[PDB]
Write a protein that binds this ligand. Sequence first.
Ligand SMILES: CCCCCCCCCCCCCCCC(=O)O
Ligand SMILES: CCCCCCCCCCCCCCCC(=O)O
Ligand SMILES: [Mn+2]
Ligand SMILES: [Mn+2]
Ligand SMILES: [Mn+2]
Ligand SMILES: [Mn+2]
Ligand SMILES: [Mn+2]
Ligand SMILES: [Mn+2]
Lengths: 274, 274
Amino acid sequence: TIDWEHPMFKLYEKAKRNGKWNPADIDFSQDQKDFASLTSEEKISALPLVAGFSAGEEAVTLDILPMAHALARQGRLEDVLFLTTFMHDEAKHVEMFSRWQQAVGIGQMDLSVFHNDHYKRIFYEALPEAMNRLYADDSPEAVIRAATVYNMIVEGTLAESGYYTFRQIYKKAGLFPGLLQGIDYLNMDEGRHIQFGIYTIQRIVNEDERYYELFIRYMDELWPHVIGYVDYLTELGKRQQQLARTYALEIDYDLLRHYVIKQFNLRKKQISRT
Amino acid sequence: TIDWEHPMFKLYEKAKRNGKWNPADIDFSQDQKDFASLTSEEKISALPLVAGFSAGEEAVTLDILPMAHALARQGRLEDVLFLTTFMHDEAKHVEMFSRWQQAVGIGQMDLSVFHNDHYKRIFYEALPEAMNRLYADDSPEAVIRAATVYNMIVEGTLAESGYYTFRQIYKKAGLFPGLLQGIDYLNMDEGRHIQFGIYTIQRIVNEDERYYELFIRYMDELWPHVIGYVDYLTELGKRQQQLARTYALEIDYDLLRHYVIKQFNLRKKQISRT
Ligand SMILES: CCCCCCCCCCCCCCCC(=O)O
Ligand SMILES: CCCCCCCCCCCCCCCC(=O)O
Ligand SMILES: [Mn+2]
Ligand SMILES: [Mn+2]
Ligand SMILES: [Mn+2]
Ligand SMILES: [Mn+2]
Ligand SMILES: [Mn+2]
Ligand SMILES: [Mn+2]
């Protein structure tokens, strides 16, 4: 039947209760004015972080499907019910960033230019490969790896840090209130996504504590590309300093960096070896 | 980007606006009392139609995924955004029937007994085979067949007729107000599902009017099992006449039957050869 007490059924219920926001309701009119008011140099200072996210959301909307397939095939009905909310969330995320991009005029703008090699390695290689694998290989190893790259690294490390960074910068400056409303909603959805990942990894580790070592290993395997992208954005911003100056933000890249590091280690700690 | 004018983006927007209902909010307390008040013979008279639906909703929640995969792989982003709402709708449908079944006490009850051979041929063979095919064969032929069996026959013919039948019987009788609230919501969701099917078949026919003949052919191929199930339910009810008598319903199986026939032909007519 439905196991009403199943953790993923409970997460499904919360998703319905907490998932009513609609990107079509966000007022982006002030964002349009803010963006127009920026200098050409101030404009470029913002784009790298938006590039990472818009492309990232698109990647994950296509790439969660194989997990829903694999779990369906295993008969995990409550997981599948929850995953329908996960996939619809990601749809709204793609929608929200595309609306912002249109409202402020950079819809055309090929933002690919802000994706370095480490980024592409995560979003264009490790992520799609690990998810697609599940179509032919739904072994515990395969499922742990998919949840690690997608939920623990892409969402749980990069996206979390991305949200924090957005707040740290533009919330201070009083800029882009529509986008920040969007990001708050995104960040609320993402908490459920991460919880799914934790639950999935933990139940597999609960069967064989040796999958714990596999989890840690896959996390450390990805870390170089995580930090390598983070260094490239850090670096990139330190050149284009004009938005920080104009808006009186000592943009502390060294504390962001450690927020990333903090997120990575925190995700490890949410998986228990025993 | 997102093509804001795309028909499936517009259907996605409507789904969000019109898709807020939550099965967890439905009051089933009166349904519990109604069901308990029924005689043992009256109880059995209702179950066949509920059997068809609960199993049917479960089938379609698992079975829409390959279509979302195939269209994603073709780069039809707006279709995929809409399909996230379609899949979440089906989740709530499975949820709604399981809640009703629990509330009135038939959760255990193996309702498989009311699935005859024609039913199994649709839901356990033709439907999963046609959807799963899309994982390895996303040809126009394959996509038309998937949309025909799923959207035009299962939803557009059987489910539509099932809703009508539910209303005709229990709405008259003043019974099962919770279930009927649920069914109204379901039926509103299903209109978008059918519209997706029409759009999908029509855009493929628009490229080669010879796919029109393929559409009609696949519809007629399934008709025998549609009517054969409908005859078995018709037949089945005519024996167990006690609920009709008790509640003063001349249950007109001959008009239902023609409602089914009417639905089938109506679906053909929504696809234009030209
Ligand atoms: C000092 C800079 C550190 C900040 C790191 C920036 C992270 C931006 C990358 C965006 C990835 C978004 C993917 C989210 C996927 C989802 O929504 O499930
Ligand atoms: C005289 C009897 C005719 C009535 C026909 C009864 C139809 C019951 C079958 C239920 C199928 C439900 C599947 C719906 C799938 C979806 O929700 O997309
Ligand atoms: Mn997201
Ligand atoms: Mn996410
Ligand atoms: Mn490097
Ligand atoms: Mn349904
Ligand atoms: Mn449907
Ligand atoms: Mn027969």
